[model samples]
Target: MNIFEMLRIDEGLRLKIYKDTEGYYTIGIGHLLTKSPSLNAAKSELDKAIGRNTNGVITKDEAEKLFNQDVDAAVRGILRNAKLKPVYDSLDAVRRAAAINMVFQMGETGVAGFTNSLRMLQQKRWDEAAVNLAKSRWYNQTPNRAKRVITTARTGTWDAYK
Candidate 1:
């Protein structure tokens, strides 16, 4: 078993994560854990403008401007790391893309610096994968985002279940 196998990347989870991350399906633009609908709505508006200006590109500058500082650098670091690349390569395109989206949504630091989860992934432990993924969500600065990702990785489809 590999990291991809342990992560259990599926279509549904991928799409859900994408939709949530991209603001295509949900009203909240930042994180699902948001309490203020108005703030979330404002975030969506700003995000749309940023997307347009950046040509739909998610860069470190944009992430920092939109979310906070250091987000972009963190994502860049994850994208460049060799260990993560293999784990990412192991996943199907959709699943891999979803992982990227989840990382972006959660923050690069959360994804790239996840030592225990990364170890579990390398060992190809699915139970640990799910748990670690869940833990990532639990510890996430942004709530609800990690849960959505884990649900997507487990189910393989996000159309029916939200």
Candidate 2:
């Protein structure tokens, strides 16, 4: 499976404005509409991004396009983290999605904070890396998503996603 398929499953597709688990106004498959200062402004930005005057709903095309852009942003940030890029470069494509998924959900800082896990990844220690990832608050917060991602890291395949 592609990274987007896993992401679309993890972060459910939503056309209408909805409050995320953290109580932020989010739309379009985990896109943070704003920093919570202005919903009005968020809608405006959303409209521009989705290329339509949206009220509460948007077409799947708009959602998918917007989602791709957001995913691209995360992918770029992940690749830019040169501290981990070596390990990233060493991994297969499926394993790389785990990193991409993490940066997508959290950010480079969040992924970078996994100090010991980074070491495990550097050594190509899939077992250790997955175990280290499971010990985090990330695993506790979103266990299902965490399992799939960590499993991907461990198995070095898309089978976990399958």
Candidate 3:
């Protein structure tokens, strides 16, 4: 499934938050939330934990340091809603957490921004999905990281896409 389908949110907000919250701290979460590689790219890494573990448990208060109430609440809500435990029953804990990270980094809105890319992903068109994902404005801003994720996701490492 696409990252957003798995995360249960739109991707546009994800990218916007990633772009807007540069250098912001994430409480229990690491600095990656506000770092490079775009929000979705970063979220892919963070989604590995979700409700299973606490590798990156940023609080709402901490989220506010960089994000407004709406975004901060959204971030916290995502962390809360992510059913990492259920997913962990079938997948590795690390993989579950990584996916949550991807969602956290790439808000639902942000993921929604890539309509064509999402369609390609939904259709299991790995190559096209990779290309469209890489060409997005978010990916354009973080080319190296984007290439890595696109390659990983397209080459049977879709779990990396989170």
Candidate 4:
């Protein structure tokens, strides 16, 4: 419960279509429907997720489904990624969720861009990992959320879940 459950609120569950900061078509708890669908499969996936003859909106139930699936997908992708596998595997559940939170907001590749932070995580250099993560444009874009996330990285606690 201390994982992506808390992120349900941090991410702000939305049922209607809107563009994310990256200008991608997004809906339902950070579900990126299309990065311009430049991948139709994802677009089609979204439509089916809501319903067969879908309206342009989803229900709270559907949003919850989307949130859970997205987090699971992000985790599997993280574990599948070469660099993140060891770093993610080395952590406890709390710290593992912290990693997921980062990946949830930014994609796996986006989180991977933090080379120094990932290295710190691999070494269990908690504070150093947080320090490196804080020095990012993502932190600047969402200071409060990033601070909570960084605090979890720095202290290896469930503080962010609060």
Using TM-score as the measure, the top candidate is 2
In model 2, pairs of residues that clash are none
lDDT of 4 by residue, 56-155 (tens): 5788888888888888898999989998988989988878888898898888999988889989888888877888888899989889888988887777
- Candidate 3: residue 119 Cα off by (Å): 1.0
Q: For candidate 1, write residues 1-162 as lDDT tens digits.
A: 322322233211221112343344322123232333454444555456456633233454444344332234434656687657667666554445446655654555557677776665556564677687766444364445456566555444453233
Please tell me which model should have the higher lDDT, number 2 or number 4.
2
- Those runs of model 4 whose alpha carbons end farther than 4 Å from true positions after fitting are 37-45
Worst 10 residues of 2 by lDDT: 33-42
Residues 33-108 of candidate 3: C-alpha lDDT, one tens digit per residue: 4355454444544444233333344444444332343344444554454333232233333333333434455655
Residue 125 accuracy (lDDT) in model 1: 67
For model 1, what is the C-alpha lDDT against the true structure? 0.47
**Candidate that would win on lDDT:** 2
Q: Write candidate 2's Cα lDDT for 35-63 as tens digits.
A: 66677877887787777789757878878
Any residue pairs clashing in model 4, and if so which?
none
lDDT of each: 0.47, 0.84, 0.45, 0.81
Q: What is the lDDT of residue 50 in candidate 2?
A: 70
Give the lowest summed-lDDT range of ten residues in model 1: 9-18
